[model samples]
Target chain A: VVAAAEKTKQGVLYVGSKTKEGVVHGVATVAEKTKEQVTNVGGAVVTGVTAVAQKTVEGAGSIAAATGFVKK
Target chain B: VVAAAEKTKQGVLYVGSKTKEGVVHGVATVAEKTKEQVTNVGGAVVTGVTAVAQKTVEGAGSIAAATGFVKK
Candidate 1:
C-alpha cells in the first residue's frame, strides 16, 4: 500500500501507506518511495483547477468513519 | 518540505505537498492527509506487499516574526 507520496528534483519520493488498496495510479512521471507505512493504503488528492472547487482525500480504516459521516 | 502524510491501515501518515515535480514511485505498494495542508511539501510512506501495493499521498515559508533570542 502507498501511505505517502513525494517528488524530488530527481522525481523520486519515499511514501507511506495511507490507504488499504495500495497505490495503483499516481500523478504520473516523477519518482516515489514507500516508507515504513503499511501493506495496503491509499492517498487520493482530488483537486479542482480554475475555480478551486471542492476537494477530497480519503484513506483506509477511515472507511467506517466516512460511512458514519455519510449516515449522518 | 513534506506537509501531510497519512496511513489508513497500519501504515501511518498525515502529511501533504505538491512539488513542482510530479507523483513519485507508487507501483510498489501503497498513501496522505493534506490534511496536513501545506504547499511544496513531501510525504513518505513505505510498505511490504502481502506485497500489497495500492496506496498513495509538504511545506515551508515564513517571514513575519519579530524579536530575536533574548541572547543573540
Candidate 2:
C-alpha cells in the first residue's frame, strides 16, 4: 500500500501531507515564511510613502504662512 | 532674496520645497505615485504567495488519498 497524508486548510493557508505525515510540515513552514516576507516588504513601502507625504504637506503650509520679504 | 518653500509632513511622509509654489506640487505628485507603486507591488507578492500555498496543500492531499499500485 502507498498511502499519503491529508490536506488541511488553516485560515487562508492550505497544506498537504502524505504517508500519514506527508507534507503538512513543509507546507506550514513555507506558508509562514511567504506570508511574513510579503508583510514586511509591504510595510516598508507604506511607511516610506507616508513619510514622503508628511514632508510635502508641511512644506506647503510653511510657504502659505510666510510673512513677506522687503527690498532696501 | 531666495525663498524656499516649507517642509511639510503628511502621515509618515516628509517633503521639502522652496518658494510659494516650489515643491509641494511635485511632492504631492511623487507621494501619490510612490504609494500606488508600493501598494500594487505588495499586493501582487501577497497574492502570488497565497496561490502557491494553496497548490502545495492540494498536491499533498492528492498524494495521501492515493491507494496502491503494485504488482508482484
Candidate 3:
C-alpha cells in the first residue's frame, strides 16, 4: 500500500507514518530525494534547451549549404 | 515494488509507474516537495546570516558598555 502525506503543525509537509518521530524520519527521505530530483531535472532542462538550439542551428546550416540555386 | 522513472518526450522527468497518469500524479509530489525544500533552506540561510549579524552587534554593544577608561 502507498503511504499518505499530511502537513505538520510547523507547516512542514510529511509523507508516510503519522507520529512525529516517524514523520521526522520519513520526511527527510522525501525532502532529500525530491530536492535531488528537482535539481537533476532542472539541470536537464537547461541541457535540453541547448540541444534543441543546436539542432536548429545544424538544420539551418544544412539548408544554407545546399547547392543547385535555381540552375541559372 | 518501488517505482521507476522516465523522461517524457517533452523533456519533463517522470518518476513512478510508467503510465502517463501515474507520472502526472507522482511528479506533482516530487516537484512540490523539492520546491519546498529549496525555499525552506533558502530562508534558513538568510535567517542564519541575519542572526550572526545581530549577535555581532549585541556582542559589540556589551563590550562597549564595559568601563575601560584608564588614565588617558
- Best candidate, DockQ: 1
lDDT of 3 by residue, A1-72 (tens): 111222222222112211221101111224532433221111111111011111112111110111111212
Q: Rank the candidates by DockQ, best first.
A: 1, 2, 3
Which digits, one per residue and each the tens of the lDDT, describe model 2 over residues B1-72?
122322223312122322221111101112221221211121111211111221222121221111122224
The CAPRI-style docking tier of model 1 reads incorrect
lDDT of each: 0.25, 0.19, 0.17
Q: How far is candidate 1 from the true structure (C-alpha RMSD, Å)?
A: 22.1
lDDT by residue (tens digit), candidate 1, A1-72: 112332233232234333332233433322234232322222233321111111123331211101011111
TM-score of chain B of 3: 0.11
Candidate numbers, best lDDT first, in rank order: 1, 2, 3
Model 2 CA deviation exceeding 4 Å by range: A1-41, A45-72, B1-17, B23-39, B43-72
After TM-score superposition, the amount by which residue B45's alpha carbon in candidate 3 deviates from its true location, in angstroms, is 26
lDDT (10s digit) by residue, model 2, range A1-72: 232222233422223211221111111112321221211121111211111121112112211111221223
- What value of lDDT does candidate 2 attain over all alpha carbons? 0.19
State the lDDT at B6 in candidate 1: 36
DockQ of 2: 0.03
Q: Could you give candidate 2's fraction of true interface contacts? A: 0.04
**DockQ category of candidate 3:** incorrect
Off by over 4 Å in 1: A1-26, A31-41, A50-72, B1-72
